[PDB]
Design an enzyme around this catalytic site. Structure first.
Site, PDB file in Angstrom:
ATOM      1  N   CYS B  27      20.964  35.112  82.617  1.00  0.00           N
ATOM      2  CA  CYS B  27      21.610  34.055  83.390  1.00  0.00           C
ATOM      3  C   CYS B  27      20.826  33.732  84.654  1.00  0.00           C
ATOM      4  O   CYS B  27      20.733  32.566  85.043  1.00  0.00           O
ATOM      5  CB  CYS B  27      23.057  34.426  83.732  1.00  0.00           C
ATOM      6  SG  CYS B  27      23.316  35.632  85.049  1.00  0.00           S
ATOM      7  N   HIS B  88      26.987  36.668  88.421  1.00  0.00           N
ATOM      8  CA  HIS B  88      26.692  35.642  87.430  1.00  0.00           C
ATOM      9  C   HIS B  88      26.440  34.314  88.128  1.00  0.00           C
ATOM     10  O   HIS B  88      27.066  34.007  89.148  1.00  0.00           O
ATOM     11  CB  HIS B  88      27.833  35.491  86.419  1.00  0.00           C
ATOM     12  CG  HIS B  88      28.082  36.728  85.617  1.00  0.00           C
ATOM     13  ND1 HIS B  88      27.306  37.078  84.533  1.00  0.00           N
ATOM     14  CD2 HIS B  88      28.996  37.717  85.761  1.00  0.00           C
ATOM     15  CE1 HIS B  88      27.743  38.222  84.032  1.00  0.00           C
ATOM     16  NE2 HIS B  88      28.769  38.629  84.758  1.00  0.00           N
TER      17      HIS B  88
END
Lengths: 145, 146
Positions: B27, B88
């Protein structure tokens, strides 16, 4: 340099990047070593790290001096930019392979051929061409006392 | 409107910011490659490090709704949230919100399909129902598209 060898052994089992063991990630392995030793480290992939080291860290004159600084308790990073991907590793104290290349620890996505747990030199992790183009960067405050 | 950002996302999906690591499976690397394509300087490191850098130097929007309309005006907008172990990050794109709250996004993830989006999931579907309401939205200072 025992405090750096210890950080290397501990970093080998961590995952700087989610889901990514440091043994398989040369940039993440160095990040965890630095985080354990409290040393600020330029961030990103190996190429970005080498750019950052070149800008703010002391560059040593030789692999022999890299080994000496490691022996004096300094965090020393061996680094070389690559056309597509660069590489970084942690230099530790010990005899120079081929009387030129210092010992190191390194993670690597490439597998064991790019990895070292302290028993390979940078001259055995980097290819026979790249090993003489390596740069060694040292942080300005000793970590081990 | 946001087409240059959606194009960067599509292009970055197939790249590998980190050696040997496809961006769809990373990510943080996915976001780096999108920013690089757009010419946008991006805080580096793992997702937690990136959120730290974004928190210190990017403007923080007030809402997922605000994030979608800034993306619709051609701004790179990063959704990010720090984690106790790992954070994230994701790229917000324009489009109708999910449940009138969560903007659409692109995201890579080492977790596989669960954490991944190629533009058809909102941030409320890549993050769990706990985290989706705690996300921050960071917008760059200049529009990248047109």
């Amino acid at each position: 340099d025992q405090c750096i060898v210890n950080a290397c052994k501990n970093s080998w089992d961590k995952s700087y990047l989610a889901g990514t063991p440091n043994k398989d990630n040369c940039s993440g392995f160095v990040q965890s070593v630095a985080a354990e030793l409290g040393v600020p480290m330029p961030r990103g992939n190996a190429n970005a790290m080498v750019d950052g080291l070149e800008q703010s860290w002391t560059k040593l004159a030789s692999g022999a001096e890299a080994a000496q600084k490691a022996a004096q308790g300094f965090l020393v990073i061996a680094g070389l930019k690559g056309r597509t991907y660069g590489h970084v590793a942690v230099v530790i104290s010990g005899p120079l392979y081929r009387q030129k290349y210092p010992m190191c620890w390194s993670g690597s996505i490439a597998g064991a051929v790019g990895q070292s747990q302290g028993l390979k030199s940078v001259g055995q992790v980097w290819n026979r061409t790249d090993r003489d183009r390596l740069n060694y960067y040292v942080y300005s405050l000793a970590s081990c006392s």
